[PDB]
Write a protein that binds this ligand. Structure first.
Ligand SMILES: CCCCCCCCCCCCCCCCCC(=O)OC[C@H](COP(=O)([O-])OCC(O)COP(=O)([O-])OC[C@@H](COC(=O)CCCCCCCCCCCCCCCCC)OC(=O)CCCCCCCCCCCCCCCCC)OC(=O)CCCCCCCCCCCCCCCCC
Ligand SMILES: CCCCCCCCCCCCCCCCCC(=O)OC[C@H](COP(=O)([O-])OCC(O)COP(=O)([O-])OC[C@@H](COC(=O)CCCCCCCCCCCCCCCCC)OC(=O)CCCCCCCCCCCCCCCCC)OC(=O)CCCCCCCCCCCCCCCCC
Ligand SMILES: CCCCCCCCCCCCCCCCCC(=O)OC[C@H](COP(=O)(O)OCCN)OC(=O)CCCCCCCCCCCCCCCCC
Ligand SMILES: CCCCCCCCCCCCCCCCCC(=O)OC[C@H](COP(=O)(O)OCCN)OC(=O)CCCCCCCCCCCCCCCCC
Ligand code: HEC
Ligand code: HEM
Ligand code: HEM
Ligand code: HEM
Ligand code: HEM
Ligand SMILES: COc1c(O)c(C)c(C/C=C(\C)CC/C=C(\C)CC/C=C(/C)CC/C=C(\C)CC/C=C(\C)CCC=C(C)C)c(O)c1OC
Ligand SMILES: COc1c(O)c(C)c(C/C=C(\C)CC/C=C(\C)CC/C=C(/C)CC/C=C(\C)CC/C=C(\C)CCC=C(C)C)c(O)c1OC
Lengths: 373, 49, 55, 76, 48, 240, 54, 373, 54, 76
């Protein structure tokens, strides 16, 4: 049957490696999170109004008067946080196990990552709190950095001299429409992966040992979905605000700036980099490269072994990379003052030098140790 | 339909009947439960409330 | 078999119970919110209307 | 798809039915040893970067505080 | 033992579904009741 | 910035599975009605919300019919006023932001609907601020309409001590000590910023129980369907 | 669900311009395709000048 | 790229019949119209507010203050009208040439038709005019007809006792989200068809004469796109209100009812049927069947020839069916009074009797004339 | 509140602050918004002319 | 796909290059005759239903008017 054929080839019988660990669950979790977000987003859209007079009032009306509306709203917010947790672990799996040699899958991935970051940014602007308004102005201002056409572009997006209702409404439209483009790009993602099949943690050709997916990696994905739902509901029902900003519960006052302005936990690494570079433009570029350096990653693989299971020096460099990514996440939070700044500057220098320079040199050294080079 | 007016066809159905009823039963119970239909659930002693 | 399947049957009810609950709240969300539900006691002045008139 | 994935030869593969085998054979019997075996093959590669992240984080915090602290000699 | 159960309500898939649905129908009653007992008692004196 | 960080207080609404004390929410609503409503607003809280929290329908109406509200346009088109309704929100203490600014010496008493949620460590902050009007130390001097509250950003809050011991009498009779009043209004403001606190925690208990059942099982089903492979014993027997 | 128009129709009560339902002064459907009489809310005649309709 | 293969497999090297007329353009036009609607809809969503206080004000702000906002709004409205014109001609092509024997393609089609009608209904509710509000109440009331669960369902959708803001906002969310589901269903529609290939107007096996699509039916689709754009822009730029209702330019008054209530013209045929049946429920059912009778159509084919090119009696019955479809479209417009009603009742009886009874009997007679039966 | 001379950004002034004042001042009738009257009235331009001259 | 679509035999097929042939050979020369040829093979099947739609539409309109026209005998 031409509709069922797809599933049989893709979901029911696809030959999958028998030895893939729990990390390979995470991408499926991302898809589930996407649906969850879409579903919760749809049930936020039946009561949200994208008017600057009524946006905060509509959000409070959702939390206070709609039956279980607080549940759907905090599920949406903590599901965005869970989406970025699963996204970061998915990207870390791709970096560690050499999955970036699937170059088309990797490039569709980094496009999906850019789209998800833009969607989450405009979604965080949407409740029109104090923190949303000052956050929007800030990043929209980021664009002004552009050398020649910057001012125009910023004003275009804002739709006026400064973010105001003009922005909110177009940000509602764009935040509505981009997750469906993300779903289509995810179909292209899984598509370009079906042409190749998944990788295994040993990094070897797993053609001799492949098993079906229906009874082996389906119940595994169901168990991972159950664990992710446990973490999401203990994030929603017990510590709902632990992943938020108290200043977003104040209305947007264009006159005042919340003093402790900071991007959400997931944008921090980038925030740190931006702050680190003295030049505004430099910051914007580095920021972009921060995400883009990944796309650049499949051209930096200089080893004869795909995975890092048998590569201890590059394992050490990888965990140092995870370490200073956590450091950059912390610095972003810290305010502008000594010595947070220097760490930020170094941490960014170390991040770009480990990804660009240290890992291919280490792979060359590791090939020399096995009498291969 | 000509082919379906058959002797074995009938036998097959008769053999299939019990299973079919079971499935309807599951759905009926399901609908009652999913909808929290109280008209029906009010009959059940424990389920009441 | 009865031990292994009973676990499948047990799990199902549990999931089934959660699935009805999740779907139930969602379904319920679209139902009237508290604001509207709290509508009653309209006051009408008889003097307002004279015979042969509707208001 | 299956059937055209790879070419192996003379590799016999025995297996058992799920219901015929214990669900959690020696789960904690060997699980613990193995988990521990695993942790000792990866702890030296994983842990010391996060250890020095903890030291840098504390240092930064303290240093920042000292930075903020007031020097009485400053005013004279 | 379960055998009797299996051969009766867990071996025929149709019956498997029947037992699941019926059980779930009652489980909610029991779960809600039991759960409420736990929650309310934990916060007894603070409700209402 | 440099600010005193309010300590952690042993509240009751902190318990993982602990709900708000509702008598304290009732007392804190009385504190807001008699003290805090003169200057602060509660635009997103309406009497109906109270019903089922610390008051009954009739009582709530009592509360509602104890206030005056404008009532849109008259048939004549002339805006008129009416007895408060369970559907009426809490009255504005100042028709417009400017009014509040003017009356409160330029300070805009923030809407205390989400204050606890909007203030970092709100419940504590609130308690601390209301109970933290200590004397300014040497070296610092504040202008009129300012007060040295270590906790307040800048330690110069326009609001004056709003709670003097025995400021108001609790109908329940619980001694109205400044603290007993600050704790009650912090519980109430908390409730205000999250009327669903109690309902949620119930679900939480339920969720845990369900996961505590489903999670273990789903694992047994997975280990059944994966035992087959996990017992596979490969063997290579080349022709040799 | 349209609004019947008062003081119009062939039954001196109401008429619904949507599909031609004529309601008598009692609001009872007399002619047309409207299924049932207009509903009478449970009002309250507190006074000959005050009526609390639901 | 593997994708290029899919890109080619459906649009470049696809073997198409050489003799398909201009009617086979129309489905591609529908896809273009879908995109056009989505694009225009996105540019309506950057300024529209789904609040009952501000919806009419936002629509007037789009028409009066946004640069070329009147152009995008009237392009959206007349593109919905063009969508239904192309949809009706696509369905008429499928009925005339025996294309309903592609049963899966036909069923995915009638699902797409239901989704498009629901999308257009909620979109017409969206500007919150006088006509939109009374139209919504009317059709939402249609649901109340349901024998037992009707009242609840209506109230659910309305989200309250009567359509009010609760409805508008959820109708904005649903009207936003359904055209992407329509796009996915159209992808399934294209798949279920390529498995079988397109039909030709002679109704014969065209395997002996097939040509590529890139140079032969692409420039033809480009020419059809150009002609459809000519008709759409002469509908927008010259007669922007010949298909709409003037009463939609008044704000929604719940107190004031209009003297005559209509949906937009493409719902009329259904409207007539509904009005015709005396029983409310009967009307609702017949109405549904009106659309559903099509799905039922592949089981009514009793002829040994697929197309109507060589079948003159069934051609006459088909044009009588098109004739009384036009009659039902006219009647819906006419008010409730003699003799419009009787025509409506007959026209509905003739419509159901021609589709259900007359065409298979005529096909049997036509098979008897060729010495086949 | 305070009143100021209109600006190029000001909209056209209201005759009445609310529609119930229009009902009170126009013997129960509500004079409609004339912004889209021509578009809202079937054959508006003609209607308008006719009504004003009819 | 192409190559496996169908089996024909001995059917020769000649053709010309686009640029080698006139773009609109005898376009109005035979186009008109053909279009007219076409219309006369389909007009009797197509047109009379729409003709009686026009008659029913007019009839309805006029009948409706007469219906609306006041009954002179009535009210007198
Ligand atoms: C330690 C004490 C117990 C012990 O020794 O256990 C041995 C056992 C390992 O035994 P082994 O024979 O060496 O390994 C074979 C596995 O058991 C074979 O099982 P497995 O570990 O491959 O199972 C698949 C994997 C599947 O895991 C996932 O799908 C995880 C998905 C990602 C995490 C959730 C997303 C969000 C992350 C946010 C950060 O599940 C787990 O890793 C554990 C699931 C536990 C479920 C709840 C049990 C109560 O340890 C565990 O399974 C660890 C977890 C349980 C303790
Ligand atoms: C009649 C007077 C002219 C005449 O006798 O010429 C012979 C000619 C008939 O020649 P034939 O040998 O019987 O047939 C071969 C066709 O000429 C071969 O050409 P064709 O007419 O089959 O062309 C394909 C057709 C393909 O048509 C479509 O693409 C239709 C697309 C859907 C409808 C349009 C979209 C909007 C629909 C809203 C409803 O395009 C047309 O219908 C004509 C396009 C003219 C563009 C403007 C030229 C100036 O008459 C026409 O071509 C009539 C159409 C052009 C006027
Ligand atoms: C956290 C520590 C997780 C851990 O257990 O580390 C050791 C583990 C060993 O894996 P391996 O040597 O391949 O052997 C596995 C089969 N025995 O090594 C691994 O677990 C590798 C896991 C790969 C994914 C790790 C993702 C960590 C978070 C990365 C976030 C940033 C990603 C990059 C962003 C840009
Ligand atoms: C309109 C008339 C168009 C026309 O020219 O009619 C004649 C044409 C003849 O077609 P045929 O006999 O197959 O020969 C063509 C190749 N020589 O016959 C045709 O063109 C057949 C066209 C088939 C599609 C007609 C669709 C008309 C609109 C139908 C709308 C309602 C559809 C059902 C809705 C429910
Ligand atoms: C009842 C005991 C309370 C409580 C719990 C609070 N107040 Fe007030 N308040 C008033 C004014 C003029 C301000 C603004 C002053 C300024 O911004 O300089 C405030 C502010 C607050 C806050 C916000 C603190 C912050 O960091 O923004 C909070 C949490 C607060 N108050 C608590 C005025 C008044 C009153 C009129 C004299 C009285 C009465 C109250 N407040 C009472 C209370
Ligand atoms: C098409 C599906 C979606 C719709 C209709 C939708 C709609 C909405 C709406 C109406 C809001 C405002 C209500 C609120 O404040 O929570 C919102 C907020 C938000 N959305 Fe979405 N959304 C969708 C998908 C997503 C996805 C996929 C993400 C993740 C990338 C996302 C991230 C967010 C975030 C972060 C917020 C802010 C939540 C907060 O107030 O803290 N949304 N969305
Ligand atoms: C929008 C979020 C994403 C979704 C829904 C998604 C979805 C998936 C799915 C379902 C798989 C197959 C299952 C698996 O192996 O985990 C997968 C694998 C993969 N994804 Fe993604 N993905 C996302 C983001 C990304 C990103 C950002 C990248 C690039 C860094 C990426 C690169 C990959 C790679 C390389 C694989 C192959 C795994 C392997 O064989 O090792 N994905 N993705
Ligand atoms: C995802 C893509 C779409 C978006 C974002 C969208 C968005 C909107 C918005 C914001 C409006 C209100 C502005 C207005 O009054 O014109 C609207 C109106 C409308 N839309 Fe869409 N739309 C989309 C696709 C469609 C499609 C595919 C149809 C056709 C079925 C459609 C039919 C309509 C109609 C009939 C209106 C009412 C126009 C009127 O005021 O007369 N839309 N749409
Ligand atoms: C959402 C709007 C629709 C789109 C975008 C669409 C798209 C298409 C496309 C691209 C084709 C192939 C080109 C062609 O033959 O015209 C096609 C063919 C077809 N469609 Fe649709 N379609 C739509 C609605 C429908 C509906 C409502 C039906 C069912 C009545 C339907 C039934 C068919 C059939 C039967 C064919 C085969 C044509 C033949 O071989 O004769 N489509 N459609
Ligand atoms: C065996 O190889 C596969 C595989 O065949 C498939 C299809 C998936 C896809 C699995 C999912 C359920 C993820 C869903 C992906 C999307 C397309 C997200 C789109 C979301 C929607 C709104 C629909 C895999 O994750 C996978 O590796 C484990
Ligand atoms: C040769 O056979 C084909 C065919 O191969 C294809 C792909 C199409 C599809 C053509 C189109 C351009 C229509 C577009 C269809 C959609 C999937 C609509 C979805 C819209 C989007 C928003 C994208 C045909 O119409 C067609 O017959 C002519």
């Amino acid at each position: 049957h031409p509709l069922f054929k797809i599933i049989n080839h893709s979901f029911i019988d696809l030959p999958a490696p028998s030895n893939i660990s729990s990390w390979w669950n995470f991408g499926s979790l991302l898809g589930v999170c996407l649906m969850v977000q879409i579903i919760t987003g749809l049930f936020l859209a039946m009561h949200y109004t994208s008017d600057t007079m009524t946006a905060f009032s509509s959000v409070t009306h959702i939390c206070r008067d709609v039956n279980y509306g607080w549940l759907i709203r905090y599920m949406h917010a903590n599901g965005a946080s869970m989406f970025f947790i699963c996204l970061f672990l998915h990207v870390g799996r791709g970096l560690y196990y050499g999955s970036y040699t699937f170059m088309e899958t990797w490039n569709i991935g980094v496009l999906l990552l850019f789209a998800v970051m833009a969607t989450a940014f405009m979604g965080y602007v949407l409740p029109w709190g104090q923190m949303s308004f000052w956050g929007a102005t800030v990043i929209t201002n980021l664009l002004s950095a552009i050398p020649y056409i910057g001012t125009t572009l910023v004003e275009w997006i804002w739709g006026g001299f400064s973010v105001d209702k003009a922005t909110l409404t177009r940000f509602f439209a764009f935040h509505f429409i981009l997750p469906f483009i993300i779903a289509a790009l995810a179909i292209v993602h899984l598509l370009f992966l079906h042409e190749t099949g998944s990788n295994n943690p040993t990094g070897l050709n797993s053609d001799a040992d492949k098993i079906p997916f229906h009874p082996y990696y389906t119940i595994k994905d169901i168990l991972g979905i159950l664990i992710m739902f446990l973490i999401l509901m203990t994030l929603v029902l017990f510590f709902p605000d632990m992943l938020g900003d108290p200043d977003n519960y104040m209305p947007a006052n264009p006159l005042n700036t919340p003093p402790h302005i900071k991007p959400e936990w997931y944008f921090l690494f980038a925030y740190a980099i931006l702050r680190s570079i003295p030049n505004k433009l430099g910051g914007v570029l580095a920021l972009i490269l921060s995400i883009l350096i990944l796309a650049l990653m499949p051209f930096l693989h200089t080893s004869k072994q795909r995975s890092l299971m048998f590569r201890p020096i590059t394992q050490i460099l990888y965990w140092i990379l995870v370490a200073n990514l956590l450091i950059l996440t912390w610095i972003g939070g810290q305010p502008v003052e000594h010595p947070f700044i220097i760490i930020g500057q170094l941490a960014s220098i170390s991040y770009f030098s480990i990804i660009l320079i240290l890992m291919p040199i280490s792979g060359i050294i590791e090939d020399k140790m096995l009498k291969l080079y | 339909l000509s082919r379906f007016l058959g002797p074995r066809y009938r036998e097959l159905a008769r053999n299939w009947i019990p299973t079919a009823g079971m499935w309807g039963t599951v759905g009926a119970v399901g609908l009652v439960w999913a909808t929290d239909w109280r008209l029906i659930l009010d009959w059940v002693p424990y389920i009441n409330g | 078999k009865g031990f292994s399947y009973l676990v499948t049957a047990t799990t199902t009810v549990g999931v089934a119970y959660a699935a009805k609950n999740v779907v139930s709240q969602f379904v319920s969300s679209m139902s009237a919110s508290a604001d509207v539900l709290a509508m009653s006691k309209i006051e009408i002045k008889l003097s307002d209307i004279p015979e042969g008139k509707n208001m | 798809e299956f059937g055209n994935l790879a070419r192996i030869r003379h590799v016999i593969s025995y297996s058992l039915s799920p219901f015929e085998q214990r669900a959690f054979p020696s789960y904690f019997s060997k699980g613990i040893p193995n988990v521990l075996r695993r942790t000792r093959e990866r702890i030296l590669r994983v842990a010391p970067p996060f250890v020095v992240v903890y030291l840098i984080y504390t240092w930064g915090n303290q240093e920042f505080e000292q930075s903020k602290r007031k020097n009485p000699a400053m005013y004279e | 033992i379960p055998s009797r159960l299996y051969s009766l309500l867990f071996r025929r898939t149709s019956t498997f579904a029947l037992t699941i649905a019926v059980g779930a129908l009652f489980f909610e009653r029991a779960f809600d009741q039991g759960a409420d007992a736990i929650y309310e008692h934990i916060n007894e004196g603070k409700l209402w | 910035d440099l600010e005193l960080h309010p300590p952690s207080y042993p509240w009751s609404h902190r318990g993982l599975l602990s709900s708000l004390d509702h008598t304290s929410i009732r007392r804190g609503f009385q504190v807001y009605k008699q003290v805090c409503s003169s200057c602060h607003s509660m635009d997103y809280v309406a009497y109906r919300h109270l019903v089922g929290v610390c008051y009954t329908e009739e009582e709530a109406k009592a509360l509602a019919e104890e206030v005056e509200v404008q009532d849109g346009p008259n048939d004549d088109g002339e805006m008129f006023m009416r007895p408060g309704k369970l559907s009426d929100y809490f009255p504005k203490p100042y028709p417009n932001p400017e009014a509040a600014r003017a009356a409160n010496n330029g300070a805009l008493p923030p809407d205390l609907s989400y204050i606890v949620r909007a203030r970092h460590g709100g419940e504590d902050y609130v308690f601390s601020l209301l109970t933290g009007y200590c004397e300014p130390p040497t070296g610092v001097s504040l202008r009129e309409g300012l007060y040295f509250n270590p906790y307040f950003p800048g330690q110069a809050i326009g609001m004056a001590p709003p709670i003097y011991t025995e400021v108001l009498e609790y109908d329940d009779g619980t001694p109205a000590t400044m603290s007993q009043v600050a704790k009650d209004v912090a519980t109430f403001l908390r409730w205000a910023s999250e009327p669903e606190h109690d309902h949620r925690k119930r679900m939480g208990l339920k969720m845990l129980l369900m996961m505590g059942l489903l999670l273990p099982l789903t694992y047994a089903m997975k280990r059944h369907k994966w035992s087959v492979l996990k017992s596979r014993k490969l063997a290579y027997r080349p022709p040799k | 669900g349209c609004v019947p128009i008062a003081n119009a129709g062939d039954f001196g009560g109401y008429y619904c311009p949507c599909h031609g339902s004529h309601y008598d002064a009692s609001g009872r459907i007399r002619k047309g395709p409207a299924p049932l009489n207009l509903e009478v809310p449970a009002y309250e005649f507190t006074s000959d000048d005050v009526v609390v309709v639901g």
